[PDB]
Write an enzyme that holds these catalytic residues in place. Structure first.
Site, PDB file in Angstrom:
ATOM      1  N   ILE A 156      -7.016   8.299   0.104  1.00 31.80           N
ATOM      2  CA  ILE A 156      -7.161   8.108   1.624  1.00 31.80           C
ATOM      3  C   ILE A 156      -6.040   6.893   1.730  1.00 31.80           C
ATOM      4  CG2 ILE A 156      -9.124   6.355   1.035  1.00 31.80           C
ATOM      5  CD1 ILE A 156      -8.640   8.521   4.094  1.00 31.80           C
ATOM      6  N   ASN A 202      -6.215  -1.212  -0.505  1.00 29.96           N
ATOM      7  CA  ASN A 202      -6.806  -0.406   0.470  1.00 29.96           C
ATOM      8  C   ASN A 202      -8.090  -0.696   0.952  1.00 29.96           C
ATOM      9  OD1 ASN A 202      -5.734   2.414   1.770  1.00 29.96           O
ATOM     10  ND2 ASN A 202      -8.087   2.530   1.110  1.00 29.96           N
ATOM     11  N   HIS A 215       0.826  -1.126   0.047  1.00 31.20           N
ATOM     12  CA  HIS A 215      -0.045   0.035  -0.227  1.00 31.20           C
ATOM     13  C   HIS A 215       0.835   1.303   0.121  1.00 31.20           C
ATOM     14  CE1 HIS A 215      -2.562   2.710   2.642  1.00 31.20           C
ATOM     15  NE2 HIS A 215      -2.942   2.929   1.358  1.00 31.20           N
ATOM     16  N   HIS A 248      -4.356   0.605  -5.701  1.00 30.74           N
ATOM     17  CA  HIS A 248      -4.766   1.223  -4.376  1.00 30.74           C
ATOM     18  C   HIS A 248      -5.965   0.792  -3.994  1.00 30.74           C
ATOM     19  CE1 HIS A 248      -5.583   4.193  -1.803  1.00 30.74           C
ATOM     20  NE2 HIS A 248      -4.601   4.354  -1.239  1.00 30.74           N
ATOM     21  N   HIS A 294       1.150   5.137  -2.780  1.00 29.78           N
ATOM     22  CA  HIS A 294       1.208   6.686  -2.701  1.00 29.78           C
ATOM     23  C   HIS A 294       2.605   7.183  -2.958  1.00 29.78           C
ATOM     24  CE1 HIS A 294      -2.045   7.022   0.406  1.00 29.78           C
ATOM     25  NE2 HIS A 294      -2.299   5.843   0.067  1.00 29.78           N
TER      26      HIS A 294
END
Ligand SMILES: [Fe+2]
EC number: 1.13.11.58
Length: 836
Positions: free
Chosen positions: A836, A692, A497, A688, A502
């Protein structure tokens, strides 16, 4: 002459800010009417003295337009009639000046024209600060997408000036109102000045710890070393990358910042005091957490209620009880999670569905250097594999590709001796799984390894544990699986993740904005997949991955957490992120033309992949249609100054540690650009989402995904072994995450698994009308429609009884990769971006 009619649509600051939104004609709007907001048209035709456009007279805003069939929420429209004539030609851009000293969010501008020319749209969506903070003037360009010829010659210099203004050099301390984009190194996360113990190694710019760059925020460095930068409560990220909301609980960033700011200290206090006990004494005491909640005093309860956004995240009794929602994993059966069949099933359809491999040569090896178990192997008991199911031999089953591996041996082994010097007793794991004759997968052995009993060359202290269902045997097996799972939770947060999503994606946002003008077609393909990623990433360095953050405290790797993620970055290769590439790399799929995605799957019943290959091919067909609608030939591409600058810069700079890697696409061919673009959209949307959104559904039962190990395996006949024997559950509970971190972890992962009501999903959702190119809009509609077809295929798949790794023992149909969701902790819905 001619007055061109314009209608300016806008949004006032208080409609968008968290501090006002604490509540979700009235002529505020009158203020805009003085000599307050002025716009000024720019030609794409008649050129002044040395080409530069021609600016039709600054006009101020008059009259509020009360309604329009299209106005929407929190939006105010105004009318403005510009003086214009044949001789100025066609408006192609416009300057804007706000004199009001309160910024506003400019949404759009429509001009209903004067030659045989339809209404020109400008899709602005940007905050306009006071005109004095700027030295130039905010320019906005019309709806037309132009390749980097920067086409209408009056516009060419306006197009290169903004590009230059968004880079804005690498100097100074960036302010709230700025839109400068630039790279820096992860030197942001520790705070050296509150002790040496609080220093964290700078990540990026060196070979030990290579890392993707992040946005340059320009703060003054630390005092005890100038190589790190001063902490601060407000980390800059370019304005308009920070996204407002009309309702709260949509400010899910605010949920996280306050959970760390305020909730974690006040809650901490009850464990430093006494109203709560510090360990859970039974599985029952954990399941009671979303039944009656955690009985806590009103000194935490009234203090942790009205703080905005953290509503419903915490269900409350009213006083003295903070409940959690039942995580999907125990809603049909509270006990099916213990099943071997489930532990193995989550490797394929779980939160981390992404890592399993077809074993090609037994015994699995380490890929660690001269410290001789890398140059050596798994001590796994070949003569202790297959407990009832099929009785083939090893190679017979490797020939059949029935054996698979979850190898967690190598990333943590360098750091194990150190993680075990502290309070946590981690265990470097691997586990061999056999594909049961009926499609399910079955764990045959876990190998619990430690480092260096006496040394560190030939240092692998392996112990293999084997499955059993009665007595101390099954209790030992359960703790064994617990040690795999805790390793897989750090690997999932830090690498699957945060790193693979990110961190890797932020250089692309910086490079795109610095070099591809807004007008550029590729920029409009990519833009929606960057929504709020720099903002959530600003907060992660502030709270999630910093010096005393939640991840350091809640996950096995501890303070070595992001450094270990940078060691694994050593191996991140851009192109193997492409899904069918990833499936092949891992030996999960073989190439095969005949088979519907050009590859044939080993473990065909595999949800993440079966479903995700469908969404990959949909993205790839969209991007190929989009790319090929602007580039006529490969030479068109090679000649594109804006795309070339862009690619050059993220290879050499944004992923600068990797600049010299031989696997990088040289952007010299179309289809190389389809591939790069398809990989970034996959990572920012379906990877993602896949990685996630199942976090609380599965990881909400800390029992099922523990994050921390506190004890090594119960010994021989000792009182720990006897505690197992006389109380397995209390033993379990004291090996995994203690209760104060279980409560922090469920607060932060509850938020991370929530869809904000204003989520723009992959499912065709762009957000107004971004281009004039009819061909593009049409092609966009086909994407959107194929996705609706995909959602139906994927839901049909969840009812096929012959597909049981889709559901498993606690009937939890794999819904993670369905494009749409409505709004909560819905276990589905693929956003367009890492939000998020
Ligand atoms: Fe995330």
């Amino acid at each position: 002459g001619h007055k061109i009619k314009g209608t300016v649509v806008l949004m006032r600051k208080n409609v968008l800010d968290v501090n006002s939104v604490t509540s979700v004609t009235l002529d505020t709007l009158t203020a805009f009417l003085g000599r307050s907001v002025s716009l000024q048209l720019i030609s794409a035709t008649k050129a002044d003295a040395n080409g530069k456009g021609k600016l039709g007279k600054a006009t101020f805003l008059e009259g509020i337009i009360t309604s329009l069939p299209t106005l929407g929420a929190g939006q105010s429209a105004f009318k403005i009639n510009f003086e214009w004539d044949d001789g100025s030609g066609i408006p192609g851009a416009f300057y804007i000046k706000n004199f009001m000293q309160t910024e506003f969010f400019l949404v759009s501008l429509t001009l209903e024209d004067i030659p045989n020319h339809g209404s020109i749209h400008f899709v602005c969506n940007s905050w306009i600060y006071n005109a004095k903070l700027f030295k130039s003037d905010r320019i906005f360009f019309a709806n037309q997408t132009y390749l980097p010829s920067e086409t209408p010659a009056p516009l060419v210099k306006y197009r290169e000036e903004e590009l230059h203004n968004l880079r804005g050099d690498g100097t100074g301390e960036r302010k709230e109102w700025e839109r400068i984009y630039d790279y820096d190194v992860y030197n942001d996360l520790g705070d050296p000045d509150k002790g040496e113990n609080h220093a964290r190694p700078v990540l990026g710019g060196n070979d030990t710890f290579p890392y993707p760059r992040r946005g340059r925020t320009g703060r003054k460095p630390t005092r005890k070393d100038p190589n790190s930068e001063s902490r601060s409560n407000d980390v800059y990220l370019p304005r308009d990358e920070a996204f407002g909301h009309l309702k709260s609980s949509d400010f899910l960033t605010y949920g996280l910042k306050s959970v760390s700011q305020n909730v974690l200290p006040l809650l901490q206090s009850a464990f430093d005091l006494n109203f709560t006990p510090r360990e859970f004494d039974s599985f029952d005491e954990v399941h009671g957490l979303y039944s009656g909640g955690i009985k806590l005093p009103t000194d935490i309860i009234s203090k942790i209620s009205p703080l905005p956004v953290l509503k419903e995240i915490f269900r409350t009794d009213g006083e003295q009880a903070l409940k959690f929602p039942p995580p999907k994993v125990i809603q049909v059966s509270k006990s099916a999670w213990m099943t071997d069949e489930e532990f193995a099933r989550e490797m394929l359809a779980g939160v981390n569905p992404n890592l399993i491999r077809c074993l090609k040569d037994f015994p699995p090896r380490s890929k660690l250097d001269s410290q001789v178990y890398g140059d050596h192997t798994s001590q796994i008991t070949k003569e202790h594999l297959e407990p009832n199911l099929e009785g083939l031999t090893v190679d017979e089953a490797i020939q059949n590709k029935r054996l698979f591996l979850l190898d967690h041996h190598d990333p943590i082994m360098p750091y194990l001796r150190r993680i075990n010097a502290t309070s946590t007793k981690a265990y470097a794991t691997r586990t061999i799984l056999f594909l049961k004759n009926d499609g399910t997968l079955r764990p045959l052995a876990i190998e619990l390894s430690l480092p260096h009993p006496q040394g560190d060359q030939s240092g692998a202290f392996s112990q293999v544990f084997l499955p059993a269902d009665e007595g101390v045997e099954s209790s030992i097996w359960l703790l064994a699986k617990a040690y795999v799972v805790v390793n897989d939770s750090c690997y999932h947060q830090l690498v699957s993740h945060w790193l693979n999503t990110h961190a890797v994606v932020e250089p692309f946002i910086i490079a795109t904005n610095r070099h591809l003008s807004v007008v550029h077609p590729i920029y409009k393909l990519l833009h929606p997949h960057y929504r709020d990623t720099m903002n959530i990433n600003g907060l992660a360095r502030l709270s999630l991955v910093n010096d005393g953050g939640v991840i350091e405290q809640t996950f096995l790797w501890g303070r070595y957490s992001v450094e270990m993620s940078a060691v694994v970055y050593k191996d991140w290769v851009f192109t193997d992120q492409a899904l069918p590439a990833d499936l092949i790399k891992r030996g999960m799929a073989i190439e095969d033309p005949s088979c519907p995605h050009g590859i044939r799957l080993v473990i065909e019943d595999y949800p993440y992949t079966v479903d995700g290959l469908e969404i990959w091919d949909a993205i790839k067909t969209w991007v190929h249609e989009y790319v090929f609608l602007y580039y006529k030939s490969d030479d068109t591409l090679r000649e594109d100054p804006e795309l070339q600058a862009c690619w050059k810069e993220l290879v050499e700079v944004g992923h600068g540690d990797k600049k010299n890697e031989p696997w990088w696409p040289k952007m010299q061919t179309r289809e190389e650009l389809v591939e790069a673009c398809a990989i970034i959209i996959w990572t920012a949307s379906a990877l993602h989402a896949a990685v996630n959104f199942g976090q609380y559904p599965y990881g909400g039962l800390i029992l099922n995904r523990p994050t921390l190990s506190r004890r090594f395996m119960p010994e021989k006949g000792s009182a720990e072994y006897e505690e197992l024997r006389k109380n397995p559950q209390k033993a379990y509970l004291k090996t995994i995450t203690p209760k104060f971190q279980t409560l922090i972890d469920l607060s932060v992962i509850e938020i991370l698994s929530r869809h904000a009501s204003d989520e723009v999903y992959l499912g065709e959702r762009d957000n107004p009308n971004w281009t004039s190119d009819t061909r593009a809009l049409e092609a966009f509609k086909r994407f959107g429609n194929k996705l609706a077809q995909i959602e139906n295929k994927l839901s049909e798949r969840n009812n096929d009884e012959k597909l049981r790794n889709r559901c498993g023992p606690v009937q939890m149909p794999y819904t993670l990769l369905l494009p749409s969701s409505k709004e909560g902790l819905t276990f589905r819905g693929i956003p367009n971006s890492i939000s998020i």
